[PDB]
Design an enzyme around this catalytic site. Structure first.
Site, PDB file in Angstrom:
ATOM      1  N   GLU B 100      31.135 -45.780 -18.514  1.00 35.76           N
ATOM      2  CA  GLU B 100      30.961 -46.686 -17.367  1.00 35.76           C
ATOM      3  C   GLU B 100      29.680 -47.527 -17.583  1.00 35.76           C
ATOM      4  O   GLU B 100      29.663 -48.758 -17.387  1.00 35.76           O
ATOM      5  CB  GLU B 100      30.876 -45.904 -16.062  1.00 35.76           C
ATOM      6  CG  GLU B 100      30.675 -46.813 -14.854  1.00 35.76           C
ATOM      7  CD  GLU B 100      30.368 -46.056 -13.570  1.00 35.76           C
ATOM      8  OE1 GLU B 100      29.583 -45.066 -13.588  1.00 35.76           O
ATOM      9  OE2 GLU B 100      30.909 -46.461 -12.531  1.00 35.76           O
ATOM     10  N   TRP B 122      36.883 -45.664 -11.582  1.00 33.84           N
ATOM     11  CA  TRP B 122      37.214 -46.803 -10.757  1.00 33.84           C
ATOM     12  C   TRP B 122      38.699 -46.994 -10.495  1.00 33.84           C
ATOM     13  O   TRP B 122      39.085 -47.980  -9.870  1.00 33.84           O
ATOM     14  CB  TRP B 122      36.669 -48.079 -11.412  1.00 33.84           C
ATOM     15  CG  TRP B 122      35.176 -48.181 -11.428  1.00 33.84           C
ATOM     16  CD1 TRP B 122      34.303 -47.558 -12.288  1.00 33.84           C
ATOM     17  CD2 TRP B 122      34.375 -48.944 -10.519  1.00 33.84           C
ATOM     18  NE1 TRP B 122      32.993 -47.887 -11.957  1.00 33.84           N
ATOM     19  CE2 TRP B 122      33.015 -48.731 -10.873  1.00 33.84           C
ATOM     20  CE3 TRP B 122      34.672 -49.789  -9.437  1.00 33.84           C
ATOM     21  CZ2 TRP B 122      31.954 -49.343 -10.171  1.00 33.84           C
ATOM     22  CZ3 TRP B 122      33.613 -50.407  -8.738  1.00 33.84           C
ATOM     23  CH2 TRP B 122      32.280 -50.179  -9.104  1.00 33.84           C
ATOM     24  N   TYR B 148      28.854 -54.477 -10.421  1.00 42.87           N
ATOM     25  CA  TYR B 148      27.706 -54.212 -11.297  1.00 42.87           C
ATOM     26  C   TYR B 148      27.525 -55.013 -12.590  1.00 42.87           C
ATOM     27  O   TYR B 148      26.566 -55.761 -12.754  1.00 42.87           O
ATOM     28  CB  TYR B 148      27.634 -52.718 -11.671  1.00 42.87           C
ATOM     29  CG  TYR B 148      27.466 -51.790 -10.494  1.00 42.87           C
ATOM     30  CD1 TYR B 148      26.207 -51.604  -9.896  1.00 42.87           C
ATOM     31  CD2 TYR B 148      28.554 -51.061  -9.995  1.00 42.87           C
ATOM     32  CE1 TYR B 148      26.040 -50.709  -8.837  1.00 42.87           C
ATOM     33  CE2 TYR B 148      28.392 -50.166  -8.946  1.00 42.87           C
ATOM     34  CZ  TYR B 148      27.128 -50.002  -8.381  1.00 42.87           C
ATOM     35  OH  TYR B 148      26.981 -49.136  -7.339  1.00 42.87           O
ATOM     36  N   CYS B 208      26.699 -49.193  -4.487  1.00 44.83           N
ATOM     37  CA  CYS B 208      25.931 -48.110  -3.862  1.00 44.83           C
ATOM     38  C   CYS B 208      24.508 -48.128  -4.499  1.00 44.83           C
ATOM     39  O   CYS B 208      23.516 -47.930  -3.787  1.00 44.83           O
ATOM     40  CB  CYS B 208      26.581 -46.735  -4.108  1.00 44.83           C
ATOM     41  SG  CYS B 208      27.910 -46.445  -2.919  1.00 44.83           S
ATOM     42  N   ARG B 228      21.849 -46.983  -1.579  1.00 42.93           N
ATOM     43  CA  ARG B 228      22.087 -47.106  -0.139  1.00 42.93           C
ATOM     44  C   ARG B 228      23.010 -46.055   0.503  1.00 42.93           C
ATOM     45  O   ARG B 228      22.879 -45.738   1.683  1.00 42.93           O
ATOM     46  CB  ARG B 228      22.673 -48.499   0.187  1.00 42.93           C
ATOM     47  CG  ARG B 228      24.109 -48.669  -0.352  1.00 42.93           C
ATOM     48  CD  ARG B 228      24.904 -49.810   0.373  1.00 42.93           C
ATOM     49  NE  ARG B 228      26.231 -49.897  -0.257  1.00 42.93           N
ATOM     50  CZ  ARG B 228      27.306 -49.196   0.139  1.00 42.93           C
ATOM     51  NH1 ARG B 228      27.242 -48.380   1.192  1.00 42.93           N
ATOM     52  NH2 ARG B 228      28.420 -49.222  -0.578  1.00 42.93           N
ATOM     53  N   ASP B 231      26.725 -39.677  -1.667  1.00 43.42           N
ATOM     54  CA  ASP B 231      27.646 -38.550  -1.463  1.00 43.42           C
ATOM     55  C   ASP B 231      26.921 -37.418  -2.215  1.00 43.42           C
ATOM     56  O   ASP B 231      27.038 -37.286  -3.425  1.00 43.42           O
ATOM     57  CB  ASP B 231      28.987 -38.884  -2.138  1.00 43.42           C
ATOM     58  CG  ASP B 231      30.003 -37.747  -2.057  1.00 43.42           C
ATOM     59  OD1 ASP B 231      29.635 -36.582  -1.746  1.00 43.42           O
ATOM     60  OD2 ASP B 231      31.190 -38.033  -2.338  1.00 43.42           O
ATOM     61  N   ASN B 239      25.066 -39.772 -10.400  1.00 45.19           N
ATOM     62  CA  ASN B 239      24.120 -40.873 -10.314  1.00 45.19           C
ATOM     63  C   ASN B 239      22.766 -40.508 -10.989  1.00 45.19           C
ATOM     64  O   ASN B 239      22.189 -41.322 -11.687  1.00 45.19           O
ATOM     65  CB  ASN B 239      23.930 -41.288  -8.841  1.00 45.19           C
ATOM     66  CG  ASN B 239      25.291 -41.695  -8.161  1.00 45.19           C
ATOM     67  OD1 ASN B 239      25.477 -41.565  -6.944  1.00 45.19           O
ATOM     68  ND2 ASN B 239      26.241 -42.151  -8.983  1.00 45.19           N
TER      69      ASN B 239
END
Ligand SMILES: NC(=O)C1=CN([C@@H]2O[C@H](COP(=O)(O)OP(=O)(O)OC[C@H]3O[C@@H](n4cnc5c(N)ncnc54)[C@H](OP(=O)(O)O)[C@@H]3O)[C@@H](O)[C@H]2O)C=CC1
Ligand SMILES: NC(=O)C1=CN([C@@H]2O[C@H](COP(=O)(O)OP(=O)(O)OC[C@H]3O[C@@H](n4cnc5c(N)ncnc54)[C@H](OP(=O)(O)O)[C@@H]3O)[C@@H](O)[C@H]2O)C=CC1
Ligand SMILES: CC1(C)N=C(N)N=C(N)N1OCCCOc1cc(Cl)c(Cl)cc1Cl
Ligand SMILES: CC1(C)N=C(N)N=C(N)N1OCCCOc1cc(Cl)c(Cl)cc1Cl
Ligand SMILES: O=c1ccn([C@H]2C[C@H](O)[C@@H](COP(=O)(O)O)O2)c(=O)[nH]1
Ligand SMILES: O=c1ccn([C@H]2C[C@H](O)[C@@H](COP(=O)(O)O)O2)c(=O)[nH]1
Lengths: 221, 326, 326, 221
Positions: B100, B122, B148, B208, B228, B231, B239
């Site tokens: 990604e 995605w 992105y 996000c 922002r 999860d 992340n």
């Protein structure tokens, strides 16, 4: 006999375990658990070359003393059962392990060195470096001496018996996160008897990460 | 001098009486977690936030309908010079997030490129139904819009379709921050932003990870990423890893060593359906972290390929399906 | 149990020595500051960051040539339901920042509007020399370009000059967030962003307050503002005030009560010429904070005027001129 | 050399002070200092209507005791007096005017040993379980006889003034009420050489005013 020795003489164990090669005969896809870190040594020496951070830790823990806490422990030992201007800890190690230590570091400075051996003789030694025939004699030598805490430094045989005869109050365990080849391991710590109570920050030292955890004896019979 | 010990009690006179039970949590739910005295392992920065939300979170509904427990504003810091922060209290895979990341760097918006490599992160966001719900009726399936990658390499360019040629169109932010880091390291303007207000509605979904800011000192690179919406149960673990990997990549191509990866969480939430799975995770004790190694031969951000990354000594607990229905 | 006490000592085995601390700080420079046992007043979140930077900051040069001591990544939280966080360890006046905020809300980019109210916050950034330095040769004096206000009301519109009519051009983020707070309070996309990458070079200077994200729970409003560059000595005190006031305004027009103002600091620095003035401020003890009152009849974000704001009971220490040369 | 009365008997002062309504000199550029907060009372009662958070703090501080710490305070008091070795409570001291301002439903202060200073009134004049003393020296005599944790001087101004003058205050628990009210009695101006602030709390809003709590400690001077 509900006055346990290790709690009276504050007997602790301090070690460092690495991961061990699966022997090339493991199955499909690996599982992990606390027993993953059990490598102790290889052919009389440490499985790894040199991990200075663990060295620095071991030293700090085995040589640290709090004088304002001694009297309370003194008060505890006698009741139970000038010389040295500085109070110190007792480090119990086996001959093999004793022999592995280098030259310029023996006996471990600021520490009361003790050695378990059925062959060595006190004489060609220093009057200042005790020796004992068996685990049971140790408790006696402790009874005489003025010390803060007593640390069992290994090796394996030493750990096994001291763990068997239940003389360990806590285990300062260093988890070395890398694999090496070993021939001597650390006993498989039983969860019902010892439980982790503290885990440190993670560090990198000499190309490997490692962390320090502490096992404490469980008061559940 | 315990004098001041009572003073500490006085200052706490207006504390909340937790004797009052909240969020339907049972004491022993966190028996092991609460049994440790010193929890200094860095993974606790993540685990403590989950515990905080579970114990003090606000019950709220959300866009998905599942409902959550949420809090606002947290910061976590991971020392990349000492470890690679891949969670150990559950198993995590990285091939997908690395692809990604490489896809973002190429400036791509074509979801088929990931699907052809079996990376399905995605997939749901590019379905005919999902795009129609976003009112993107004239968008081809898997054409994610100016997300992105498009913003990192062409911020401001007009988006047409995922197959158009955008070479030299828009602002190449990625190229610019690399140049600033190399040539003007003490600049306080080294930011990469994906939140292009003008293009939000054309995106399969608003980003996000809003922005990434960099800082250089004594040949070391640190990165702050502002998220922002987080999860905690499912997204955050990945992340942390994505941006920690990105920080290493940027550092390497700029001849610097990575220092800290700083994660700022805005709307931090725990989905109602992840509660049981998280109760189990929090009672697991972290293992020392693994390390990440990059092929040292790669000198430009655009030259990394999947085989250039290696995770070593990853010790972890067994996987956990966050979903109660899973 | 005192045994866990010795364990605490072991965990600190690899902690720094004292003379390894990196800056030239004399012990008695913070004698009063260090004499306090409990420093719970919220002003200390600010005072403690300055202290952390002075004692452990990194010495670095910067765009201004003055040089600084800096750190990366901090978070302060102020409870607006309990007080208005106007610093008390030095005197601050708010007329200008409030006029600045109203100017932003009107979407203005004309520096003369503020000069005419005798507010000089943007004076230096609009001079002929300053603009030419930014290569804005064809920009009239005081025409600041597409800065804050323009981005908040017209993100994405093409900027022409400060006198043009931009009605219905670009995205009106401000109206959009107010609508989201009123109608979709649990949305995790309530963000106001000033960092328009495509317009950065046209601005007299890039923005420092990058974005604001809102959070709504139980009739209360919280706001997080991310500041990429923070002048601790001069800018931050006013920045805390500005966004605290902005949160009160947004809350009021949306029939909500303000809760927390959360400030995230990216590159946080203390300029070398402010060091003597801050050593003095840090040894002053804070006074209880003032309160902020807004005229209750204002129901729309665009209807506030300077007379609708009142700061009550502001008790403070003497005004300080941060500049060493000042 | 030898002991100070306030240390042996742990005598503290606790009060709440607002800003005083001076009204017309040059207020847009007024100067502030610790003395800014000095308003104590008006017409025999408090300057403010009601600030519940301060009442809550006052009650918490004056009723709190730590039994495990008492066995030591006892030793200290006995030794100092050369004397040998129900539910524990603090002692609270108040002037006659202060006592009279307290509503009947709150007297005597719950869970505390109440003491009142007065010359005009005697024990026959009170129906309540309270100790009446007519001299400050008599408090010391009394403290020497009771079993109590700490002793808090509750005001009013006449009382605060003489205890500070006689230097019988170890620490001052001071609430800064951030609002203005008409007052006729004030807290004495504290000398910064004799007392210094050692703690400041979080800031709060209660009954339309913000307020905080600070602690002054007697100095080494
Ligand atoms: N990872 C770690 O933290 C540590 C690793 N090690 C490694 O382990 C290795 C040594 O391991 P291992 O073979 O288990 O042996 P040990 O070193 O534990 O002990 C060996 C010695 O213990 C004596 N001994 C054993 N049982 C008794 C008893 N009941 N009473 C008295 N003396 C007794 C023997 O004396 P004798 O035969 O004379 O009779 C013997 O020489 C080294 O490679 C060392 O580097 C060592 C310490 C720590
Ligand atoms: N803001 C705050 O924190 C507090 C405010 N207050 C306020 O202060 C006011 C009371 O102030 P004030 O008027 O100074 O009076 P006080 O409450 O200080 O009472 C002084 C009177 O108490 C007696 N007394 C004092 N010292 C002695 C002594 N050494 N020996 C014998 N008797 C003594 C005398 O009583 P008598 O004449 O009978 O002989 C004297 O007239 C009220 O308005 C009250 O509400 C009170 C406490 C706290
Ligand atoms: C493994 C070590 C150190 N670390 C922990 N946590 N626990 C121990 N029990 N330790 O070893 C004690 C016995 C061996 O000591 C040494 C061995 C060598 Cl080879 C050298 Cl160079 C120096 C020394 Cl002091
Ligand atoms: C001011 C107060 C309470 N707060 C602090 N921090 N310190 C004090 N010494 N206080 O007063 C104690 C004596 C007066 O108590 C009362 C007085 C009145 Cl008027 C009423 Cl209504 C109820 C009560 Cl309990
Ligand atoms: O990299 C990512 C992408 C998404 N999410 C989560 C956050 C939200 O739960 C959901 C996106 O929903 P909105 O915040 O846009 O409503 O996905 C993450 O945690 N990390
Ligand atoms: O509201 C503001 C505006 C500016 N600054 C400061 C931060 C920097 O010291 C300088 C802007 O310079 P750059 O970061 O753009 O270099 O002004 C603030 O702190 N707050």
């Amino acid at each position: 006999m509900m006055e346990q020795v290790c709690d009276v003489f504050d007997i602790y164990a301090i070690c460092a375990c690495c991961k061990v090669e699966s022997k090339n005969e493991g199955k499909k896809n690996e599982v992990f658990n606390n027993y993953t870190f059990r490598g102790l040594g290889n052919k009389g020496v440490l499985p790894w070359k040199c991990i200075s951070l663990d060295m620095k830790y071991f030293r700090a823990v085995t040589t640290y003393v709090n004088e304002s806490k001694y009297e309370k422990l003194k008060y505890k030992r006698c009741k139970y059962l000038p010389n040295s201007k500085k109070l110190q800890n007792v480090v119990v190690m086996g001959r093999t392990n004793w022999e592995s230590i280098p030259k310029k570091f023996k006996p471990l400075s600021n520490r009361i060195n003790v050695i378990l051996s059925r062959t060595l003789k006190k004489e060609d030694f220093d009057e200042d470096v005790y020796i004992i025939n068996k685990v049971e004699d140790l408790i006696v030598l402790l009874g005489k001496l003025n010390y803060y805490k007593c640390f069992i430094l290994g090796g394996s045989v030493v750990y096994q018996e001291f763990l068997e005869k239940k003389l360990i109050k806590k285990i300062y365990f260093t988890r070395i996160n890398s694999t090496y080849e070993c021939d001597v391991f650390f006993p498989e710590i039983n969860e019902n008897e010892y439980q982790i109570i503290s885990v440190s920050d993670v560090y990198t030292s000499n190309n490997t990460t490692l962390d320090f955890i502490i096992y404490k004896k469980t008061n559940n019979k | 001098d315990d004098e001041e010990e009572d003073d500490f009690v006085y200052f706490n006179f207006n504390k909340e009486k937790e004797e009052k039970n909240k969020n339907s949590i049972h004491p022993n739910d966190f028996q092991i977690y609460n049994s440790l005295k010193y929890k200094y392992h860095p993974e606790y920065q993540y685990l403590n936030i989950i515990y905080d939300i579970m114990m003090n979170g606000n019950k709220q509904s959300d866009r998905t309908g599942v409902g959550v427990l949420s809090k606002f504003g947290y910061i976590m810091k991971f020392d990349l010079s000492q470890y690679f922060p891949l969670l150990t209290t559950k198993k995590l895979f990285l091939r997908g997030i690395i692809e990604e990341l490489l896809w973002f760097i190429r400036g791509e918006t074509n979801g088929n490129t990931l699907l052809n490599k079996n990376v399905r992160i995605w997939e749901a966001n590019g379905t005919r139904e999902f795009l129609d719900n976003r009112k993107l009726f004239h968008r081809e399936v898997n054409d994610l819009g100016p997300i992105y990658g498009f913003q990192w390499r062409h911020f401001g360019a007009e988006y047409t379709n995922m197959y158009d040629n955008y070479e030299n169109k828009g602002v190449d932010q990625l190229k610019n921050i690399i140049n600033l880091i190399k040539n003007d390291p003490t600049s306080r303007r080294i930011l990469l932003c994906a939140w292009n207000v003008k293009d939000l509605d054309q995106m399969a979904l608003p980003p996000c990870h809003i922005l990434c800011q960099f800082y250089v000192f004594d040949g070391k690179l640190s990165c702050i990423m502002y998220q922002r919406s987080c999860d905690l149960g499912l997204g955050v673990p990945f992340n942390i890893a994505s941006y920690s990997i990105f920080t290493h990549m940027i550092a390497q191509v700029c001849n610097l060593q990575p220092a800290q990866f700083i994660h700022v969480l805005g709307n931090a939430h725990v989905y109602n359906n992840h509660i049981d799975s998280l109760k189990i995770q929090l009672n697991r004790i972290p293992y020392p972290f693994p390390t990440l190694k990059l092929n040292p031969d790669i000198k430009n951000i655009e030259d990394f390929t999947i085989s250039d990354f290696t995770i070593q000594n990853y010790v972890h607990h067994e996987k956990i399906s966050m979903d109660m229905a899973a």
